[PDB]
Ligand binder design. Sequence first.
Ligand SMILES: CC(C)(C)NC(=O)[C@@H]1C[C@@H]2CCCC[C@@H]2CN1C[C@@H](O)[C@H](Cc1ccccc1)NC(=O)[C@H](CC(N)=O)NC(=O)c1ccc2ccccc2n1
Ligand code: NA
Lengths: 99, 99
Amino acid sequence: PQITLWKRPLVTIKIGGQLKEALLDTGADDTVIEEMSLPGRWKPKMIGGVGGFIKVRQYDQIIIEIAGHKAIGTVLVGPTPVNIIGRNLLTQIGATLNF
Amino acid sequence: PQITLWKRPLVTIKIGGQLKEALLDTGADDTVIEEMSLPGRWKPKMIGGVGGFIKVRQYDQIIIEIAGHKAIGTVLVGPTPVNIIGRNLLTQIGATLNF
Ligand SMILES: CC(C)(C)NC(=O)[C@@H]1C[C@@H]2CCCC[C@@H]2CN1C[C@@H](O)[C@H](Cc1ccccc1)NC(=O)[C@H](CC(N)=O)NC(=O)c1ccc2ccccc2n1
Ligand code: NA
């Protein structure tokens, strides 16, 4: 689809058996989701943006369905105010910015 | 252009006669730039990022060129780690996200 930017570009995602809303975020290197359980091993990470850094758990090789399109990649889990789909997964669903 | 997301979507902007690098960010509601001087009066705003809130100066009706496309709109100035072009100006240059 073509998504305009008059409002936040929020989509439904499926991750870990759960439906969530997330922001399609070209300004994010990483995909960061609010607290949830994910299977497998993880490692701690610090990620930053405006306002500084938060501590997250890094899970690798996680499958997500983003607006109907499946992708696999690293997912970070922690106290983000909004769930964000960053470039590591946007690339996999073929997302581009066009103007 | 069509901008893919394998790398950060960094473009050149021109503001106050100066060239700067900035991130085209569909996840950002607002445009925020690192400290610089802009003309006129400003108003206060607090904006929230992944790591918390920062105080910024809001300048309205600022002339800015984004990857060659002219816009005139609101620019926030403050302690952002990266210059960010948000949806308020992405919509003026006709940007969409497509997949
Ligand atoms: C810029 C502002 C107007 C405040 N908007 C936002 O910041 C909104 C806030 C929303 C609610 C909280 C959760 C994040 C979302 C999306 N963000 C936009 C969102 O696109 C935001 C923009 C950004 C980029 C770089 C530096 C700072 C900020 N990106 C991010 O926060 C991501 C998070 C991550 N993946 O690690 N940061 C980065 O990708 C990133 C890249 C370079 C950096 C350099 C130094 C310091 C930090 C750096 N962070
Ligand atoms: Na894993």
